[model samples]
Target: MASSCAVQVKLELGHRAQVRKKPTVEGFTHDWMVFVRGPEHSNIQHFVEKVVFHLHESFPRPKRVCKDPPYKVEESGYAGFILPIEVYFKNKEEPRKVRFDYDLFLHLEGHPPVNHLRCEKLTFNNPTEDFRRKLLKA
Candidate 1:
């Protein structure tokens, strides 16, 4: 049977999809924040201690590590797509740590409310026998 136990993490990319380009970068500019939290209304710290975000290597600062609550990294990009994000969770126990990969897409523009981007959701769980078999067969 499929497992009922699962862990879901919510990742918010940017405050909003369309952002103001106060100052332009290469003729385009936008800002984003990689936010993390638990499902619905849950304490994120209760599940994880910290979160670290990794952006493109060409970025001025490639890594943004947040040790406090409201775990997120604020960044700006002139372009979008194929931006791989690696998220790491820290907690009290030391199990095989889980890493989440996201190829984020952001819509950048000089104006806001015209195009708005929203948060995306991802869920994960321990592989059950049935789930593993299904994967292997596929």
Candidate 2:
């Protein structure tokens, strides 16, 4: 996704969800590397400072936080459910972090050999002075 406008900057981010099926003991489940960021063409870090992908409680260190761009969370496991992804902005003026609920669909109806990605959008009704100027830097 992308960001647009002066009065209202809309950020389009993609939840790059990757899922692969392998046959092994507990490995037959799935391997996922979900990357969250703006489209490959822009500097998403201007607005987003970090992101935390909270996995299921069963996962060790389920709270995965990425401080740099390409904020991602990867893991290997069986079954899936709602993935709570929280993205923190570069500044406090933007309030707090925004959460994303990705329904990690791992049910393999077919062994697809690629990542299933999707783009989502976020909008700031009327950005503050600094945010407005910074967004324009893009």
Candidate 3:
């Protein structure tokens, strides 16, 4: 059911696809407060910039841009720090609700010999399921 939808989804910045370097909340920096209800349209650009900034801070030395975004899109390559998330919906408006369930398959480039992750899968179950259920009701 989700596999087909997954193909169209994109890993946007701030989406739940990142692995933070610091596990503690006290290590937090910058503002990832894109979740607030008011002014939903304003913080998008800033949110993206913040993620890029945080990426550098998280991984001081990350992989170079292996492949540019297809077409004239942003040059976001597969860097170790740039967390990739599968976006289920973007600025959707209507009675129709949405479901965002995905996985993160990752591996650090260039350092394969030293160590490498084959592929990671982050399934958005339970809490995500509940959220979607509510969305459907809405």
Candidate 4:
């Protein structure tokens, strides 16, 4: 089972790092650290199971997946494109799933920027007494 009060997910794309060569070309390019997180201002670290990323068609076998803490991957060489990501919650008998569609772009010097299927922060709601009891019992 899952809850409707689930925390929101965001794709986090960090600053690009200079690189000398790409997979097929040698030029001024960079790699983006794509990861997942909840609310940026929130102080909570959320853990989920099987965070999967579907990259663009140009990439070979574009499905990149991870788990739990540091639930993300890295993308390099390519310029930019839209990315789709999905998250499967751990522990529940029927795992809860969340999906997000994010457009990843180049990181600019002064750009209030962010990921291709990346997440940055986490937040949670106050659990009800019944939820607490059920959680503890389980």
Candidate 5:
């Protein structure tokens, strides 16, 4: 049956970056943590199967897969870059995927001064019965 119900879920791209205590010409310049999460009170795991984090290729492992709710990764770097996030949706056996890109910066002036936190809402249209059931419950 076509439910025609609209379900909304909020997702976030959050990060914390700080300048190092000492200047480094041989070591990384900043340490940062990046993450993808739902609102604190909601259940993202209900709809999302897992997340594949795409980091810079210079790292040990560039494509990181997180198969759980707390989808996050941390690293240190000398420059800013775009982080590509691959979101995998949950559907009986199908791997539905979406992509999001965030410009991560630690030394830029226009970056969010307080905290690098960004949020977006996902809307489901004509959701499947099973998907609607899970979203509507809470």
Candidate 6:
């Protein structure tokens, strides 16, 4: 069987290109990049699935914040949201690109706007050099 996989693309969640304008409240915004490939192969789907599961299912703050009724009518002390990095598919017969950013649209804590999502930088397996190099080279 012919393979569907194509040229591997790397995206390292880098720093925010520009800060999103804060809302009236003390809103927060952050950016991230995760490596979805290796030298021989890539597990982009698995990695993306894991991220979706953790963010949409395992996260605690969203539920806690948006517990009240009205379903996006009021505030929940926290506005939960997430954004996914873009991915491009090359080397395929019909090359294309797509950005799965469902995480970015999640409205939590009744606000429908991300007001209470916090993140920290950590080295999981390896650093994202492509993202880092941009800063250095710039």
Go through the candidates in order and give the C-alpha RMSD of each one to the true structure.
8.1, 5.1, 15.1, 6.7, 3.1, 15.2
**Residue pair clashes in candidate 1:** 17-117
Best by lDDT: 5
Q: Candidate 3: misplaced stretches above 4 Å?
A: 1-56, 59-91, 94-138
In candidate 4, stretches whose alpha carbon ends up further than 4 angstroms from where it belongs are: 1-28, 38-47, 91-95, 107-138
What are the lDDT figures for the candidates, one per model? 0.52, 0.66, 0.25, 0.54, 0.76, 0.29
Q: What's the true lDDT of residue 52 in model 4?
A: 81
lDDT of 1 at 69: 65
How high is each candidate's TM-score?
Answer: 0.57, 0.76, 0.17, 0.55, 0.82, 0.21
Better-scoring candidate (TM-score), 1 or 6: 1
lDDT, candidate 6, 40-82, per-residue tens = 3433332222221123342343222212211121221223445
Candidate 1 vs candidate 5: the lDDT winner is: 5
Ranking by TM-score: 5, 2, 1, 4, 6, 3
* lDDT of each residue in 1-138, candidate 3, tens digit only: 543211111222222222334433554322221111102232222111112111233444532221212101122223324333222222223212232222222333322212112222222232334344432332
Worst 10 residues of 4 by lDDT: 129-138
Supply every candidate's count of residue pairs whose N, Cα or C atoms clash at under 3 angstroms.
1, 0, 1, 14, 0, 7
Q: Estimate, for each residue in 30-51, the C-alpha lDDT of model 5 and write its tens digit.
A: 7788888877757677777788
Report the lDDT tens digits of candidate 4 across residue range 1-138.
365453333435333333333443544365666666544543113335577888888777899877555666666654767778776654344335556776666754445444223344433344444433333332
Colliding pairs, model 6: 12-33, 13-32, 13-33, 79-114, 79-115, 82-103, 82-104
Query: Candidate 5, which ten residues in sequence have the lowest lDDT sum?
Result: 106-115
lDDT value, residue 57 of candidate 6: 40
Candidate 4 positional error at 57, Å:
1.6
Query: Residue 109 in model 2: shift from native, Å?
Result: 6.9
